[PDB]
Design an enzyme around this catalytic site. Structure first.
Site, PDB file in Angstrom:
ATOM      1  N   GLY B 191     -66.571 -66.848  29.284  1.00  0.00           N
ATOM      2  CA  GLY B 191     -65.151 -66.912  28.976  1.00  0.00           C
ATOM      3  C   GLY B 191     -64.322 -67.033  30.233  1.00  0.00           C
ATOM      4  O   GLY B 191     -63.230 -66.461  30.315  1.00  0.00           O
ATOM      5  N   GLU B 214     -67.520 -71.709  28.979  1.00  0.00           N
ATOM      6  CA  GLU B 214     -66.259 -71.697  28.245  1.00  0.00           C
ATOM      7  C   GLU B 214     -66.324 -72.604  27.032  1.00  0.00           C
ATOM      8  O   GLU B 214     -67.284 -73.356  26.834  1.00  0.00           O
ATOM      9  CB  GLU B 214     -65.088 -72.133  29.138  1.00  0.00           C
ATOM     10  N   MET B 235     -69.920 -68.204  23.256  1.00  0.00           N
ATOM     11  CA  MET B 235     -70.616 -66.998  23.715  1.00  0.00           C
ATOM     12  C   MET B 235     -71.200 -66.167  22.575  1.00  0.00           C
ATOM     13  O   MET B 235     -72.033 -65.294  22.840  1.00  0.00           O
ATOM     14  CB  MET B 235     -69.690 -66.106  24.536  1.00  0.00           C
ATOM     15  N   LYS B 248     -64.215 -61.118  32.459  1.00  0.00           N
ATOM     16  CA  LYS B 248     -62.855 -60.710  32.808  1.00  0.00           C
ATOM     17  C   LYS B 248     -61.905 -61.036  31.666  1.00  0.00           C
ATOM     18  O   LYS B 248     -61.805 -62.197  31.247  1.00  0.00           O
ATOM     19  CB  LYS B 248     -62.388 -61.380  34.097  1.00  0.00           C
ATOM     20  N   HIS B 252     -61.389 -57.270  25.949  1.00  0.00           N
ATOM     21  CA  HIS B 252     -60.176 -56.770  25.298  1.00  0.00           C
ATOM     22  C   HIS B 252     -59.632 -57.706  24.223  1.00  0.00           C
ATOM     23  O   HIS B 252     -58.727 -57.292  23.491  1.00  0.00           O
ATOM     24  CB  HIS B 252     -59.068 -56.469  26.323  1.00  0.00           C
ATOM     25  N   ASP B 253     -60.172 -58.924  24.081  1.00  0.00           N
ATOM     26  CA  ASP B 253     -59.770 -59.838  23.017  1.00  0.00           C
ATOM     27  C   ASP B 253     -60.399 -59.496  21.669  1.00  0.00           C
ATOM     28  O   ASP B 253     -59.983 -60.061  20.655  1.00  0.00           O
ATOM     29  CB  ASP B 253     -60.159 -61.281  23.368  1.00  0.00           C
ATOM     30  N   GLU B 280     -61.042 -55.422  33.713  1.00  0.00           N
ATOM     31  CA  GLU B 280     -60.056 -55.168  32.654  1.00  0.00           C
ATOM     32  C   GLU B 280     -59.044 -54.135  33.124  1.00  0.00           C
ATOM     33  O   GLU B 280     -59.310 -53.345  34.025  1.00  0.00           O
ATOM     34  CB  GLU B 280     -60.714 -54.645  31.355  1.00  0.00           C
ATOM     35  N   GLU B 312     -56.844 -52.767  24.028  1.00  0.00           N
ATOM     36  CA  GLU B 312     -57.225 -52.184  25.309  1.00  0.00           C
ATOM     37  C   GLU B 312     -57.987 -50.879  25.083  1.00  0.00           C
ATOM     38  O   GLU B 312     -57.875 -50.237  24.041  1.00  0.00           O
ATOM     39  CB  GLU B 312     -56.005 -51.943  26.194  1.00  0.00           C
TER      40      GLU B 312
HETATM   41  N1  LIG Z   1     -66.774 -68.063  21.715  1.00  0.00           N
HETATM   42  C1  LIG Z   1     -66.333 -68.189  22.966  1.00  0.00           C
HETATM   43  N2  LIG Z   1     -67.204 -68.642  23.930  1.00  0.00           N
HETATM   44  C2  LIG Z   1     -66.802 -68.783  25.231  1.00  0.00           C
HETATM   45  N3  LIG Z   1     -65.512 -68.483  25.584  1.00  0.00           N
HETATM   46  C3  LIG Z   1     -64.642 -68.053  24.652  1.00  0.00           C
HETATM   47  C4  LIG Z   1     -65.018 -67.892  23.329  1.00  0.00           C
HETATM   48  N4  LIG Z   1     -63.936 -67.441  22.658  1.00  0.00           N
HETATM   49  C5  LIG Z   1     -62.903 -67.319  23.525  1.00  0.00           C
HETATM   50  N5  LIG Z   1     -63.334 -67.693  24.762  1.00  0.00           N
HETATM   51  C6  LIG Z   1     -62.577 -67.726  26.016  1.00  0.00           C
HETATM   52  O1  LIG Z   1     -62.268 -66.417  26.435  1.00  0.00           O
HETATM   53  C7  LIG Z   1     -61.207 -66.516  27.368  1.00  0.00           C
HETATM   54  C8  LIG Z   1     -60.378 -65.240  27.268  1.00  0.00           C
HETATM   55  S1  LIG Z   1     -58.902 -65.261  28.316  1.00  0.00           S
HETATM   56  C9  LIG Z   1     -59.792 -64.823  29.838  1.00  0.00           C
HETATM   57  C10 LIG Z   1     -59.929 -66.019  30.782  1.00  0.00           C
HETATM   58  C11 LIG Z   1     -60.544 -65.724  32.146  1.00  0.00           C
HETATM   59  N6  LIG Z   1     -61.827 -65.016  32.038  1.00  0.00           N
HETATM   60  C12 LIG Z   1     -59.544 -64.925  32.956  1.00  0.00           C
HETATM   61  O2  LIG Z   1     -59.756 -63.740  33.189  1.00  0.00           O
HETATM   62  O3  LIG Z   1     -58.507 -65.449  33.379  1.00  0.00           O
HETATM   63  C13 LIG Z   1     -60.440 -67.800  27.029  1.00  0.00           C
HETATM   64  O4  LIG Z   1     -60.408 -68.678  28.151  1.00  0.00           O
HETATM   65  C14 LIG Z   1     -61.222 -68.396  25.858  1.00  0.00           C
HETATM   66  O5  LIG Z   1     -61.373 -69.801  25.838  1.00  0.00           O
HETATM   67  C1  LIG Z   2     -49.833 -56.197  33.070  1.00  0.00           C
HETATM   68  O1  LIG Z   2     -49.303 -57.239  32.304  1.00  0.00           O
HETATM   69  C2  LIG Z   2     -50.215 -58.075  31.678  1.00  0.00           C
HETATM   70  C3  LIG Z   2     -51.555 -57.782  31.678  1.00  0.00           C
HETATM   71  C4  LIG Z   2     -52.433 -58.686  31.015  1.00  0.00           C
HETATM   72  C5  LIG Z   2     -51.997 -59.778  30.421  1.00  0.00           C
HETATM   73  C6  LIG Z   2     -50.611 -60.093  30.433  1.00  0.00           C
HETATM   74  C7  LIG Z   2     -49.765 -59.215  31.064  1.00  0.00           C
HETATM   75  O2  LIG Z   2     -48.399 -59.506  31.124  1.00  0.00           O
HETATM   76  C8  LIG Z   2     -52.861 -60.845  29.673  1.00  0.00           C
HETATM   77  C9  LIG Z   2     -52.289 -61.260  28.278  1.00  0.00           C
HETATM   78  C10 LIG Z   2     -53.389 -61.959  27.406  1.00  0.00           C
HETATM   79  C11 LIG Z   2     -52.949 -62.545  26.190  1.00  0.00           C
HETATM   80  C12 LIG Z   2     -53.890 -63.174  25.382  1.00  0.00           C
HETATM   81  C13 LIG Z   2     -55.239 -63.212  25.758  1.00  0.00           C
HETATM   82  O3  LIG Z   2     -56.206 -63.843  24.965  1.00  0.00           O
HETATM   83  C14 LIG Z   2     -55.702 -64.514  23.842  1.00  0.00           C
HETATM   84  C15 LIG Z   2     -55.646 -62.643  26.962  1.00  0.00           C
HETATM   85  O4  LIG Z   2     -56.989 -62.663  27.359  1.00  0.00           O
HETATM   86  C16 LIG Z   2     -54.697 -62.006  27.771  1.00  0.00           C
HETATM   87  C17 LIG Z   2     -55.165 -61.399  29.082  1.00  0.00           C
HETATM   88  N1  LIG Z   2     -54.284 -60.378  29.558  1.00  0.00           N
HETATM   89  C18 LIG Z   2     -54.697 -59.624  30.779  1.00  0.00           C
HETATM   90  C19 LIG Z   2     -53.904 -58.334  30.999  1.00  0.00           C
END
Ligand SMILES: Nc1ncnc2c1ncn2[C@@H]1O[C@H](CSCC[C@H](N)C(=O)O)[C@@H](O)[C@H]1O
Ligand SMILES: COc1cc2c(cc1O)[C@@H]1Cc3ccc(OC)c(O)c3CN1CC2
Ligand SMILES: Nc1ncnc2c1ncn2[C@@H]1O[C@H](CSCC[C@H](N)C(=O)O)[C@@H](O)[C@H]1O
Ligand SMILES: COc1cc2c(cc1O)[C@@H]1Cc3ccc(OC)c(O)c3CN1CC2
Lengths: 343, 346
Positions: B191, B214, B235, B248, B252-253, B280, B312
């Protein structure tokens, strides 16, 4: 630079949507029913219509954001967090007559309003653009005509705000005494006149409004509704009330409204204006009380804006009222008198 | 009447000012889109420019532009996002300096534009349905499709750029504290977004072979980072064979069940000595008006509205995920203001 915690500026959009959710879930009334108390999310869910076993955990997620932001008081006990009202969230509970700020808060964060806010930068970029018109294809009052969800939300927002404003006005302002008749131009659903007559029983009230607002109004006896267009003319009136109307319009249109008012009044008649006034600005209630409606005007209305006392004085004088008086009420709220002279 | 007397004399009047809460993020959005913070920054921080001076650097021929911009900026100033002096002139503050791009062109702007995007806010209108109805996702209910698939058919850009900027910011902080990358030879980012995380890691540790794993529509955007190769997949079906894995802002998703599935697939892809490195924010157990609290609560509400059961978590909950997924050893590395690196050892 603390870029990492700067990411936390996303709370600014999270917090109003969390508050809207809690309002729609009736959280504040539920807490209030427990006494001047702190309730767990599980206890609050006991008063929410839901069959969802996970409801309390989800609610806690919304409320703990409100607590960290000092809208609710929060303390952790043996069964998790518990939430109470604060000095700032008390206004979210309906009073003896059922009025709270809730209708205003639900209107100003309504989908039609928020959608328009996405185009507020166009007022900077392009001459004469109204964000709401660009977003929705019609001006706000026409839209409220066609869309009853927004008509109702807006009319109830204005009515609740009217009760709140006049409860503050009557603490300070005495100029309604000795009046015999008051025509409220753009008077909403008539709540303003209802409050005034409640305090001054011998004032005859005439609410002058658009038809879609009158049709939505409760039947207040003693308030007579007249349909019309203030830009075409105002009914003959001993005195006129203009509350939260001038700030909807640019200077030209405001002056036109006031000239029509002048023509409807007899010698010695008064226009009584009730508005917030731009303070002389900071992190204080007066500032926010003017800046919040100012940004709402910027996104919703044709050149509407909040004004200083000097700007209001200029409108009055340009429209034919050589005699003006200004009455600070509270936290930026003012009553102003524009007097047509006697011989 | 004694109970209702508690609402007799409440300052409802200034309670009307709570509408400022929705006004403020939309003013901020507008200022970002008009490039106000970079324009102000050009005057040397600490310096204050009038709206006329700022508008001079905005492409518009609208004579009323300065008055209009002043209306947006003075709300920002009263709320302590900008500094104001009285017309009025505006400067940056400790809270808005993050809105200016750094030496590498990175700021929080892409994240703030994503989290106030129309699709996100539209979904926020239905966050109460998570309370009211079992198993409803506000984004899915609002838009008819899940968030990652929605990004697939397309906002893929807005979100991917937000995650990339956040990645640079996070890893700039991680590298001040955490040293556990120094002896790795290969890292698969499950991811991994558009690959910015791996690009930062490889910039600091050039002998690391980076594999970004990804969804295909995310890789379609990805820049050619040296040392980083992109692989498309899902994944939940499996993870490429990996000496070490980076996770990373992925756990939390997802709710516990799907997070455990992700981690079990990671486990299956690792050798007996491989580790999962999780990055995280960590939810505090006692919350207040502090940066740690808001840094967890803000993404938590975004997860609530956007993602399938995402949330979270506390350190204890992360340890529970690791144990349930087959990782008997965990190590926790507080980085900063709630941001953590955690190592899950197989
Ligand atoms: N089934 C799956 N397989 C691989 N990646 C996936 C997935 N479902 C969601 N994701 C990916 O999970 C990511 C979560 S956002 C986190 C993005 C990156 N690791 C960062 O920290 O900036 C997204 O980019 C999304 O495309
Ligand atoms: C401290 O403030 C913030 C902390 C964080 C995020 C945005 C903030 O403003 C973002 C918001 C976000 C939204 C959707 C996501 O998946 C759909 C996702 O991975 C994230 C990641 N996180 C990381 C932690
Ligand atoms: N051309 C017009 N003629 C009469 N009323 C108008 C009008 N255009 C707009 N209005 C009314 O102006 C009002 C402004 S909102 C203020 C409502 C009320 N005075 C209050 O203070 O609560 C709306 O109710 C709207 O219907
Ligand atoms: C102090 O807080 C507030 C003050 C005020 C308003 C809303 C607030 O939250 C509202 C918002 C509003 C929006 C649209 C209108 O016409 C389209 C309108 O007349 C008003 C009136 N004003 C009165 C002052």
């Amino acid at each position: 630079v603390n870029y990492l915690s700067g990411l936390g500026l996303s709370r600014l959009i999270c917090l109003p949507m969390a508050l809207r959710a809690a309002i729609e879930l009736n959280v504040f009334e539920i807490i209030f029913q427990a006494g001047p108390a702190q309730l767990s999310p599980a206890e609050i869910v006991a008063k929410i219509p839901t069959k969802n076993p996970n409801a309390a955990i989800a609610l806690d997620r919304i409320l703990r954001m409100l607590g960290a932001s000092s809208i609710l008081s929060v303390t952790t006990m043996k069964d998790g967090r518990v939430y109470g009202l604060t000095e700032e969230s008390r206004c979210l509970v309906a009073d003896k007559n059922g009025v709270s700020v809730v209708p205003m808060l639900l209107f100003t964060s309504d989908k039609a309003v928020v959608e328009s806010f996405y185009n507020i930068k166009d007022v900077v970029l392009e001459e004469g653009v109204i964000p709401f018109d660009r977003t929705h294809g019609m001006d706000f009052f026409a839209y409220a005509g066609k869309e009853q969800s927004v008509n109702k939300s807006f009319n109830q927002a204005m009515g609740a705000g009217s009760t709140i404003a006049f409860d503050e006005v009557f603490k300070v302002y005495k100029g309604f005494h000795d009046l015999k008749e008051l025509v409220n131009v753009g008077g909403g659903i008539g709540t303003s006149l209802s409050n005034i007559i409640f305090k001054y029983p011998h004032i005859k009230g005439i609410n002058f409004e658009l038809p879609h607002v009158i049709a939505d109004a409760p039947n207040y006896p003693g308030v007579e509704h007249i349909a019309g267009n203030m830009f075409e003319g105002v009914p003959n009136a001993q005195n006129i009330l203009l509350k939260w109307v001038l700030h909807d319009w640019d200077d030209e249109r405001s002056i036109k409204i006031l000239q029509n008012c002048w023509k409807a009044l007899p010698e010695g008649g008064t226009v009584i204006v009730v508005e917030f006034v731009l303070p002389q600005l900071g992190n204080n209630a007066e500032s926010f009380n003017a800046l919040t409606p100012d940004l709402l005007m910027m996104t919703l209305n044709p050149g509407g804006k909040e004004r200083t006392t000097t700007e209001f004085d200029g409108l009055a004088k340009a429209a034919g009222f050589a005699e003006t008086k200004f009455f600070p009420i509270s936290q930026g709220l003012h009553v102003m008198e524009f007097h047509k002279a006697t011989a």
